[PDB]
Design an enzyme around this catalytic site. Structure first.
Site, short mmCIF file in Angstrom:
data_model
loop_
_atom_site.label_atom_id
_atom_site.label_comp_id
_atom_site.label_asym_id
_atom_site.label_seq_id
_atom_site.Cartn_x
_atom_site.Cartn_y
_atom_site.Cartn_z
N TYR B 120 -40.77 -61.72 117.77
CA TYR B 120 -41.78 -60.88 117.81
C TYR B 120 -41.63 -60.07 116.71
CZ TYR B 120 -44.00 -63.46 121.60
OH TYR B 120 -44.83 -64.43 122.20
N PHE B 396 -43.65 -58.03 132.81
CA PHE B 396 -44.88 -58.85 132.97
C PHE B 396 -44.97 -59.93 131.83
CE2 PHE B 396 -45.66 -55.11 130.23
CZ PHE B 396 -46.19 -55.63 129.18
N1 LIG Z 1 -47.44 -62.27 133.66
C1 LIG Z 1 -47.16 -62.64 134.86
N2 LIG Z 1 -46.17 -62.45 135.57
C2 LIG Z 1 -45.73 -62.96 136.49
S1 LIG Z 1 -44.32 -62.35 137.46
C3 LIG Z 1 -43.44 -60.92 136.61
C4 LIG Z 1 -42.49 -61.29 135.34
O1 LIG Z 1 -41.38 -61.13 135.64
N3 LIG Z 1 -43.06 -61.97 134.16
C5 LIG Z 1 -42.14 -62.57 132.98
C6 LIG Z 1 -41.79 -63.97 133.06
N4 LIG Z 1 -42.77 -64.50 133.30
C7 LIG Z 1 -43.10 -65.16 134.69
C8 LIG Z 1 -43.88 -66.46 134.48
C9 LIG Z 1 -45.05 -66.18 133.58
C10 LIG Z 1 -44.47 -65.96 132.21
C11 LIG Z 1 -43.16 -65.24 132.18
N5 LIG Z 1 -46.38 -64.08 137.14
C12 LIG Z 1 -47.49 -64.42 136.60
S2 LIG Z 1 -48.46 -65.33 136.92
C13 LIG Z 1 -49.61 -65.40 135.80
C14 LIG Z 1 -49.36 -64.49 134.84
C15 LIG Z 1 -47.89 -63.79 135.46
C16 LIG Z 1 -49.93 -64.21 133.45
C17 LIG Z 1 -51.31 -63.56 133.71
C18 LIG Z 1 -52.02 -64.47 134.56
C19 LIG Z 1 -51.93 -66.03 134.97
C20 LIG Z 1 -50.83 -66.44 135.59
#
Ligand SMILES: Nc1nc(SCC(=O)NCCN2CCCCC2)nc2sc3c(c12)CCCCC3
Ligand SMILES: Nc1nc(SCC(=O)NCCN2CCCCC2)nc2sc3c(c12)CCCCC3
Ligand SMILES: Nc1nc(SCC(=O)NCCN2CCCCC2)nc2sc3c(c12)CCCCC3
Ligand SMILES: Nc1nc(SCC(=O)NCCN2CCCCC2)nc2sc3c(c12)CCCCC3
Ligand SMILES: [Cl-]
Ligand SMILES: [Cl-]
Ligand SMILES: [Cl-]
Ligand SMILES: [Cl-]
Ligand SMILES: [Cl-]
Ligand SMILES: [Cl-]
Ligand SMILES: [Cl-]
Ligand SMILES: [Cl-]
Lengths: 396, 396, 396, 396
Positions: B120, B396
Site C-alpha cells: 500500500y 473494515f
Molecule cells: N469491509 C467488510 N468487512 C467485513 S467484517 C470486518 C473486518 O474485519 N474486515 C477485514 C477483513 N475483511 C473481511 C472480509 C472482507 C474483506 C476483508 N465484512 C464485509 S462483507 C462486505 C464488506 C465487508 C465490504 C463492503 C460490502 C461488500 C461485502
C-alpha cells in the site's frame, strides 16, 4: 545475621551464592574484570553466625541523560539472598544500607537491570528504557528508494574479525555513548571481556563476526540451534548513513532466513524497507531501571525540550521532598518549598520519566502521577520528552 | 478487460472472488449490512470478455483526528484480483479509478487495513496507528496502591449478556469515538453485526460476555482451543476510573491463566500493576493506513500541540503539491507556494505522521522525510504529536 | 461363526462394524452411492450365533493399464473384523471366499487401498502406484523461461464454483482416466458424492474452489487449521499446456504461503520452476495395490515398451502357474508350460511390476524376484516400464 | 574489484569469508586435507582495493558414469560473495573464469552440491542425482521369507571400531565407487578426515560404530538429541547379500526406535520387509549437480541401454553446439552438424539426463526439452536410463 562490607575471605562465599542464584554465571575468573568497577565500600554481605546468606553491591558507572549530560551512576548488581534465608527482610536491610552509602557518596542516580519486574518499584526504581526485539525475514526485505547508500560504487562496510579492530569499535562506541541518553561509558576491562566472548566456545556459542563502517559497527553470531537465525548482539551507529549501510550488509547474509536485534522502540529500520511489517516486534521488556537519589540534583542536571514555553510548578516526591520546579530554555531550577504541591508521584515514577521513555500522561492515566491541571500534564509530557531517542547501553 | 461500476448482476461474481480471496469470509447474508456503507459509484469491477476478475470499493466512514475533529473518510475494502489475472496491472487501474472518484467526491483522506505491509506504500498509504497485543498472566497480577477503585463498597462493574445492553454499549462507544484520534462512527448495521457475533457458534467461537460500567465496557470470550485464555475483543473506556474498574474485573476471572487484548502502545494497564512486566507485549502490527487525498484540507482540519511556538515552513509532497505551512495556537494554515521547499516527503509519510503515531525524527532518520534544519524537525515532531494517544477503532 | 452373503437385515450391523472400524466414516446415507458399485454376491459377512463380527466386499471398477487398455477390476473395500474376534482367521476366510468369487466371475485383477502396509502382501496384493505429496512455498516460485503459457493475453483458466461446471469436469476426467495407467472410470454416483463434499461443512472443511481450463481442472480448499495452506484435492490435466496454466493460477493464490498436492513421482511441476527444490516432497506412500487374479489374461491384456527387441522366457508365479512368456511389438503371449522356470516370483511381486511403478531390477536386488540371467532382468525392466507415468485415480 | 588466483597471503582472508558464509565450517586445520584436491589455478578470489570479498575454486575429482566409465570432474566448492558486495555480478565473473579454466584444462564435466536450488540452473548446472531419506521404525520391522541371510549359522557382519578397519572400508568403497554411477574416487586425505569424525566430540557428535561384512560396511552414530534414533552416515554394499546382512544387523539395534539413512530412490530396503511402508521416505532433495563442459566428449564417454535399437538424431544445446547424435550397441557418436535440430535443450537439462536420474519424457512435459517426435523421446528415455541405479558418493 550481621550486615557489613565483605573482606577478601568473604568473596568465595559470595561466588558460591552467585553460582546458586544466577544461571548465567561466567565464574570467578571474569569476575576480576567486573570487580574493578566496585568501589571500596561498594558491597554488603550478610553472614549466618560462617557462610554468606545475602549480598549486594554497586558499580561506578557514567550514564548519559537528555542534553548529552553524563551523570555518575551507582549500578546495582550481584543482589542475592540464599534460598535458606528468604522472607527474613535481608534484601530490605541490604538495599537500605547500599542506598545510604550511594547517597552519602554523592551519586545523583542509581540504576539496575531487573531479574523480575515486581521487586524494584518498592525500592524507588522505575523502568526508564524499553528493549524492543526486531526479527527481519531478510528473504523478502527490499530497501526503499528513499533509503541511503543504495547507489553504485563500493560498500563502505567491511566484514572483519572483532579482535583485530578493537580500537575502531571503542572509538565508535565512545562517540555513540556520549550523544545517546541511556549511554554508558564502557571501561577497558569490559572491552577485554566483550572480545573474549567474540571467539567460538566448544559445544557453546558460535564465532562472532563484525561489520565495520567509519561511523558504525554490528557484532553478530549465528544462533546455537537455529542455523538460519543471525543474532545482532550490538549495533552502534553515530550517523543515519552508517545505520543503513550496516543494515544493507546484514540483509545480504544470504545463508540466513532471519536477522534479530534487541534495539529501542524508535529504531528506524522498519522505515528503511518497502514493507515496514517485515521487521516484526517479537519481544518487549523494561531495560535499565533508575532510582533518583537526589531529586534537585537530577532534575537540574538534565536538558529539557526547547520547544515548550517557560513554566513553574511545585513537585512532591513521596518521602523525597517538595520542590518549586521552574523549566525554560531547556534548563530546570529545582528548589525547596512548603507551598501547595501541584504534582505528586512516588520516587520510582520520576525514574521512569527521567530519560523520556514514558509519558507523564500515561503514568497520570494509571494514577501513578497526581495533578488537577491537564495543561501542566501536557507541559511535563513535552519538557521531559527526549529529542534523541533513549537506548539501552549494556547489561550489568 | 473492462473497468466499470458493478451492476446488481455483478455481485454474485464479486462474492465468488471474495470467497476465494479472503479466508475470513462471513458470506453474502452479512454482506447486506456492510453494503449499506458503500455509496453509489463506491465500487469498481474488472470483467474478462463474463466473470469478475478484479474488484475494489470504498465505504463512507467518519474518522476522529487530533483536536477531536471528525473527517469524512473513504474506507478502502474488498480489494481482490483473481489468481488467474495477477501481474496484469489490474490493482493499479482499480486503485487509480477509486482514488479519482474519492478525490472528486471531496474526501480529504482515504483509509484501509492492510492484508500485507508491502502493497500500500506505493499507493500513498502510510501506517498511521499501531496495534499492541498485551497478554496478562492474571495469576500474579496485583494492583498498585496508587491504582483507582481499590477501596471497599460495591464494584461499579456488572457481568451482563451483550444483547440485553446494546443501548448502553452504543452510548459509551459514541462518546469514546468522538474524543479519541483513530475513532470511527459505528453505524447501526455494524452494531447489529457485532451483537450477532456475541452468541456461541456450533463448533466455532464461544459465547461473548460483557463487563459494563457507567463510563466503559469490555467484550470478551474464552479462546476456542486454549481454555485458560480470555480474549478481550473490545474495551472502550471514557474515564481512567472505568478503565481500572474493568481491568480489576478481568483480573478477577479466576478460572483463566491469561487475559489478552489488542490495544494501543500507550495503554496504561501495565502501570496499574505492581509488576509492569506481567502485561507482556506478545504482538505488534500496523493498524489503520491513511492516504491524504487533499494535503491543504487535511493539514488545516486537524489540531496541533498548543505547547510549541508559532512557526512557518514550505512542505513539498512528491506529486502532491508544495505548500507554505504555518502552525500556531494549535491551528495550521496551508496555502500554495513556489518558494524553495524546506521539507520533502512522499504522500504515504504524511499519512503516517497525520495521527501522531510516528515521529518526524524517526521517518527523517530513514530519509523518508528530507530537511536540512533539525530545529524544524523538532518543531514538526512536537506539533504533529497527539495529546490523546491514537487508537484503532475497528477493522473494515 | 458362519460365512455368507449379507441380506438387507445384515447392513445395519455392517454399518455399526464400519463406524467402529473406520474413523473417516461418511455414515449410511452416502453409503447408498457406494453400494451401487457392489454387485450381487459382492459382499461376505461373518455372524456370531446375531451381530456382524466380520465383513468384506468388492466393487465393480474399470482400471486403465499400460497401452490404454481398460480391465474389469474387483475393488476390495469395507474389510473389517470386530475387535472382539481378532486372531480367529476370519480375514483369511473372508478374503479366500471373495477371491474365489472374483476369479469365477472372470475379473483378471483385484485392487485395494491399504489401511496398513503389512497385511496385504500375504494375500498376493503388491503396491502398484506411489503417492507423492509436493508442497510449494509459492512466495519464492518463479516459472522458468522455457515453461509454457508465460506470454501476454488472457489466462485460459477460470476460477469457478465446482457445482456449476460438473459436465466440464466429467468430460476432462473421462479423457484423463482413458489415457493414464492407474485411471479409474468415475461413475455418476461418485460425481454426485464429489460435488457434495465441494460445499463448506459447519465446523469442518472449507468451501472448495475450481480452476477450469479447456483441457484440465484443479479442485482445492484452504486447510481447516493452517489458513496459509491450500490443499489441491484433485488436478486432472490432459495436455502439458493445461498442467502449466493450472499451476500458474495456483502459484497466483497470493494469500497462501503453501500449495500442497498428492501427485505421482513423475509430476513435471518441479521442472516448471527456476528452483526445482521449491516443490519439496513432504510425504510418500503406496497407493493402489494389485492382485493379479489370472496371470495369462493380465499379462496378455497390457501393452509393453516397443523399444525392446522380441524375447521369450518361462515365468513361475508361486502357486499361480508356470508360463512361456513371449514379448515383442509391445504385445505379450502367455501360455502353459512345464519347461524349466527362468523367472520366479510370488503373485504380489507381479502386481507391483504390472503398472510400471516398480523395476524388476529393484525387486530382484531384494530377492523378491529370482532369475540367474541379468540380461533377462534388463529386458523385463524395459518391457514392463510404462511410457505414460502411472498415477492414482481416487481412493475406494 | 580485481579477479585473480589467490596467493598464500590471500587464504586467511578466504577462511574469514568461509567462516561468515558457511555455518558447517570445520576451520582451517582440516582445510589442509581438502586443499590438496585443488589444482594450481583451481581458485579465484575478488579483492576490494585489501580483504577477500569473493572466492570460488574447483577440486580434481573422478566421477563414475553409466557403463562404469570414470570421468575427470571439476568439483566446484567454496563459492562465496561477502554480504557487503551482493548484487555486484561477482558470482557471474568468478563462475565464468573458473568455467574458462575448467574447459581449457580438458574436463568434460563439472559438478557441485547446491546450497540453494535456484542459483545453479542459469550456470548450466542440472540436478543429476536424488537424495532419499528412509526412516525405519525398527520395532515393527520383520524381514520377508524371500530375503537373503535369514538362515541359521553365524552372522557374516561384525560390530567394529572404524579406526581399526580403515583398509577394509577403503577396499569395499573402492569396489563400490567403480561399479556405481555417481561414484567418486575418495583420496587418502578424505579417509583421514572421515575417520577423525568417527570419534566422539565433547558436547557434540557421539562415537561412530561400524558394521563390517566381506562385501559391505555401514557407519552409524546415535543422534545428539534424539537418543532413540540411529543415523547411518554411509552404507556401501557391493552385493545384495551384504546389503541385507548389514540391514539385518541395523534392525537388531534393539535400544533404537528408528534407523534413518540418506540413500537413493531405488534402495531395495523397503522390499526386504514384510511391510514396505515401515521404511518411510522422510526427505527428498537434489544431490550432485552436473555441468556438461564438452557435449561431444561427455555423450561419447558414457554407455547407453543395449535394449534400444540403433537410432540417429540432431541435438542442439542452447549456446553449446548442434550435433548429429547416433546411439547403438550402447555406444554414442556425437559429431558437428548444421542440419535441422530434432531435439533442443539448455545445457543444465543435459546434466540432469546424463546419469539417468531424470527421464527425457518428464523434462519434455515441462518444455525444458523440445522435440516434435514422441518416438524419439521414448528412444532418448530408454537410451539415457541407467541399468545400475545412480547414487550420490559424498558431499564436497
Ligand atoms: N469491509 C467488510 N468487512 C467485513 S467484517 C470486518 C473486518 O474485519 N474486515 C477485514 C477483513 N475483511 C473481511 C472480509 C472482507 C474483506 C476483508 N465484512 C464485509 S462483507 C462486505 C464488506 C465487508 C465490504 C463492503 C460490502 C461488500 C461485502
Ligand atoms: N554485574 C556483573 N555482570 C556480569 S556480565 C553482564 C551482565 O549481563 N549482567 C547481568 C546478569 N548478571 C550476570 C551474573 C551476575 C549477576 C547477573 N558479570 C559479572 S561478574 C561479577 C559482577 C558481574 C558484579 C560485580 C563484581 C563481582 C563479580
Ligand atoms: N469404499 C467406500 N469408500 C467411501 S469414500 C472413498 C474413500 O476414500 N475410501 C477409503 C476409506 N474408506 C472410507 C470408509 C469406508 C472404508 C474405508 N465410502 C464408502 S461408503 C461404503 C463403501 C465406501 C463400501 C461399499 C458400499 C458400502 C458403504
Ligand atoms: N569442499 C570442502 N568440503 C569440506 S567437508 C565436505 C562437505 O560436506 N562439503 C559441503 C559443505 N561445505 C562445507 C564447508 C565448505 C563449503 C561447504 N571441507 C572443506 S575445507 C575446504 C574445502 C572443503 C574447499 C577446498 C579447499 C579449502 C578448504
Ligand atoms: Cl570491594
Ligand atoms: Cl542490551
Ligand atoms: Cl454499490
Ligand atoms: Cl481492532
Ligand atoms: Cl450387495
Ligand atoms: Cl488420490
Ligand atoms: Cl591453490
Ligand atoms: Cl551423501
Amino acid at each position: 545475621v550481621t550486615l557489613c562490607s565483605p573482606t577478601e575471605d568473604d568473596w568465595p562465599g559470595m561466588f558460591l551464592l552467585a553460582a546458586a542464584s544466577f544461571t548465567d554465571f561466567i565464574g570467578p575468573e571474569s569476575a576480576t574484570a567486573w570487580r574493578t568497577l566496585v568501589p571500596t565500600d561498594g558491597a554488603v554481605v550478610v553472614r549466618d553466625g560462617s557462610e554468606v546468606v545475602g549480598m549486594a553491591l554497586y558499580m561506578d558507572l557514567r550514564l548519559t541523560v537528555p542534553g548529552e549530560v553524563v551523570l555518575p551512576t551507582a549500578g546495582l548488581s550481584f543482589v542475592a539472598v540464599a534460598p535458606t534465608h528468604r522472607r527474613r527482610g535481608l534484601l530490605r536491610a541490604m538495599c537500605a544500607e547500599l542506598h545510604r552509602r550511594i547517597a552519602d557518596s554523592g551519586y545523583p542516580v542509581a540504576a539496575l537491570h531487573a531479574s523480575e519486574g515486581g521487586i524494584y518499584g518498592r525500592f524507588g526504581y522505575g523502568p526508564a528504557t524499553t528493549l524492543h526485539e526486531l526479527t527481519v525475514d531478510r528473504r523478502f526485505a527490499r530497501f526503499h528508494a528513499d533509503a541511503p547508500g543504495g547507489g553504485l560504487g563500493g560498500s563502505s562496510v567491511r566484514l572483519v574479525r572483532p579482535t583485530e579492530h578493537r580500537g575502531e569499535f571503542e572509538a565508535i562506541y565512545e562517540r555513540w555513548r556520549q550523544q545517546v541518553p541511556g549511554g554508558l561509558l564502557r571501561p577497558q576491562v569490559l572491552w577485554d571481556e566483550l572480545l573474549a566472548e567474540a571467539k567460538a566456545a566448544p559445544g557453546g556459542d558460535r564465532e562472532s563476526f563484525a561489520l565495520l563502517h567509519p561511523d558504525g559497527y554490528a557484532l553478530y553470531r549465528v544462533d546455537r540451534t537455529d542455523l538460519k537465525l543471525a543474532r545482532v548482539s550490538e549495533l552502534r551507529a553515530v550517523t543515519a548513513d552508517a545505520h543503513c549501510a550496516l543494515w544493507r550488509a546484514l540483509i545480504g547474509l544470504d545463508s540466513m532466513e532471519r536477522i534479530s536485534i534487541i534495539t529501542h522502540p524508535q529504531d528506524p529500520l522498519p522505515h528503511l524497507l518497502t514493507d515496514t511489517r517485515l521487521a516484526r516486534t517479537t519481544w518487549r521488556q523494561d531495560g535499565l531501571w533508575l532510582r533518583i537519589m537526589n531529586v534537585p540534583a537530577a532534575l537540574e542536571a538534565r536538558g529539557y525540550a526547547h520547544e515548550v514555553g517557560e513554566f513553574s510548578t511545585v513537585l512532591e516526591v513521596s518521602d523525597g521532598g517538595r520542590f518549586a520546579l521552574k523549566i525554560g530554555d531547556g534548563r530546570a531550577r529545582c528548589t525547596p518549598t512548603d507551598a501547595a504541591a501541584e504534582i505528586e508521584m512516588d520516587r520510582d515514577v520520576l525514574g521512569s520519566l527521567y530519560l523520556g521513555a514514558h509519558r507523564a500522561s500515561t503514568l497520570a492515566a494509571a494514577n501513578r502521577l497526581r495533578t488537577k491541571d491537564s495543561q501542566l500534564l501536557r507541559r511535563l509530557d513535552a519538557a521531559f520528552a527526549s529529542d534523541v531517542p533513549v537506548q539501552t547501553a549494556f547489561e550489568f
